[PDB]
Amino acid sequence: KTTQPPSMDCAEGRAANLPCNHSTISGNEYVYWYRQIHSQGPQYIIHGLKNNETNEMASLIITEDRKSSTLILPHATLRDTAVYYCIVRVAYRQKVTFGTGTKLQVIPNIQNPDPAVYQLRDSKSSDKSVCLFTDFDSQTNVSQVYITDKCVLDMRSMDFKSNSAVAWSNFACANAFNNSIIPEDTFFP
Amino acid sequence: AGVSQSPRYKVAKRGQDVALRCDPISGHVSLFWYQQALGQGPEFLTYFQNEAQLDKSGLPSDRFFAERPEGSVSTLKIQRTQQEDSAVYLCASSLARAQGASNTGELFFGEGSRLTVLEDLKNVFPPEVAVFEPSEAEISHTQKATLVCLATGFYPDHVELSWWVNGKEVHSGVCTDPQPLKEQPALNDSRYALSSRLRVSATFWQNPRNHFRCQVQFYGLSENDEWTQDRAKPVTQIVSAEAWGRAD
Ligand SMILES: [Cl-]
Ligand SMILES: [Cl-]
Ligand SMILES: [Cl-]
Ligand SMILES: [Cl-]
Ligand code: NA
Ligand code: NA
Numbered sequence A: 001k002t003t004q005p006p007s008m009d010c011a012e013g014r015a016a017n018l019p020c021n022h023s024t025i026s027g028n029e030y031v032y033w034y035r036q037i038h039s040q041g042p043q044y045i046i047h048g049l050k051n052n053e054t055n056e057m058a059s060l061i062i063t064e065d066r067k068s069s070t071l072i073l074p075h076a077t078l079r080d081t082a083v084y085y086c087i088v089r090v091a092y093r094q095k096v097t098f099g100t101g102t103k104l105q106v107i108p109n110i111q112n113p114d115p116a117v118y119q120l121r122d123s124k125s126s127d128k129s130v131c132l133f134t135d136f137d138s139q140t141n142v143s144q145v146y147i148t149d150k151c152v153l154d155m156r157s158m159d160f161k162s163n164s165a166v167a168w169s170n171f172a173c174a175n176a177f178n179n180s181i182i183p184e185d186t187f188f189p
Numbered sequence B: 001a002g003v004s005q006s007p008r009y010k011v012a013k014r015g016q017d018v019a020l021r022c023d024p025i026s027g028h029v030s031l032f033w034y035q036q037a038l039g040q041g042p043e044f045l046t047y048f049q050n051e052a053q054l055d056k057s058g059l060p061s062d063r064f065f066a067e068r069p070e071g072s073v074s075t076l077k078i079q080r081t082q083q084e085d086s087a088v089y090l091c092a093s094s095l096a097r098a099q100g101a102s103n104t105g106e107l108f109f110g111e112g113s114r115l116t117v118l119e120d121l122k123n124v125f126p127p128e129v130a131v132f133e134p135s136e137a138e139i140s141h142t143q144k145a146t147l148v149c150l151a152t153g154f155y156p157d158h159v160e161l162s163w164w165v166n167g168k169e170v171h172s173g174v175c176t177d178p179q180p181l182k183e184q185p186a187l188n189d190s191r192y193a194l195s196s197r198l199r200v201s202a203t204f205w206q207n208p209r210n211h212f213r214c215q216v217q218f219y220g221l222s223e224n225d226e227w228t229q230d231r232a233k234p235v236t237q238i239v240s241a242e243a244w245g246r247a248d
Helices: B135-144
Strands: A007-011 A015-022 A029-036 A043-048 A059-064 A068-073 A084-089 A102-106 A116-121 A130-136 A152-157 A159-167 B004-006 B009-013 B018-023 B030-036 B043-049 B053-055 B062-068 B076-078 B087-096 B113-118 B128-132 B145-152 B159-165 B168-170 B172-175 B194-199 B213-219 B238-245
Touching: A007 A015, A015 A029, A015 A084, A029 A059, A043 A059, A043 A068, A043 B159, A068 A084, A116 B135, A116 B145, A130 B145, A152 B062, A152 B172, A152 B194, A159 B145, A159 B194, B004 B087, B009 B018, B030 B076, B043 B062, B043 B076, B076 B087, B128 B213, B128 B238, B135 B145, B145 B159, B145 B213, B145 B238, B159 B194, B194 B213
Parallel strands: A007 A102, B009 B113
Antiparallel strands: A015 A068, A029 A043, A029 A084, A059 A068, A084 A102, A116 A130, A130 A159, A152 A159, B004 B018, B018 B076, B030 B043, B030 B087, B043 B053, B062 B076, B087 B113, B128 B145, B145 B194, B159 B168, B159 B213, B172 B194, B213 B238
């Protein structure tokens, strides 16, 4: 009964708009928004009928024809990276039919990119080392010797965000991340 | 004060019976069961209003059976378990229609019960955990210190990775891979590898009294599962890797 884009990227540090379409909504039905974090169960955010709603979690904008609605997260952080389910349910029943929802990815804009590949020695071993490709801008795509995907961390108290990828083998980091285009200005100590 | 689901993770041999328990919020009359597969939304299974199972239109087959005998605690039983039953079984509870002031009419969910059906339990393995100390070049180039944790050779994908600084869990400056890597992608039921980072200030890492620990909570076999291999039973356990701060 609801349609949503399966995946979406949004800017970090900005309000995020999440669209939903429910064309055949009845007068008795409400619009509900649920959020599901990885390895967690869905969690209620907000609901509305016709009026615009606002709580400490989000804002819900329903059109006057009630055919579509928008979930607005006030300030998108890395913790807002989850699946968002827009559902519609008749006022008397409780059963919820979930669609595919929206995989929201909160992406920061790296103001000062510093791409570099570092070698990290094991805390307790010899011939045990990983490669760390880090501080590359959000436009860099890393291609999978084991290479992990891009990961965004947030040093919250430092107002700092960084991207990284890890590579290891049982080999030299200099040639570890060469399959995808790594900035030519990458520091290789 | 929430919905509890047990066990969090369940490893089942193909053909054996499984039972998944749900503890809804006290006083809630509605109980729901959902089945959720990888990259898919929760699919309705069954509904309970107190002890009466009013809707079971979502139950996949005859092997699926649910109970809520006293209108509270519910059990979802899956007989002669098949590989296609491998999913996250979610339980939800709510408190009727317009019962009480400011009743949002929301569904309260448990954290789910992940079931993984395997042909052979000989493939169940706990992870090996290693911590990789921040690079000296990283500290002098950025004044930041990234600790890398590697969880390797675990099967199935029943892990929880977390960082611990001086006995307290840290979430800031942490990024764990949203999904693991297959160590042998040309093999079925291949073991996994998972990475995570903990980025702290170089000053914080250079303190040798600061304790760092990467914890990997693994979910394997229970006590009832029989183990006849010559290696240690791959039971539900925590595997850690520790490191002190390093001055320079
Ligand atoms: Cl468990
Ligand atoms: Cl600790
Ligand atoms: Cl923290
Ligand atoms: Cl713990
Ligand atoms: Na999150
Ligand atoms: Na990172």
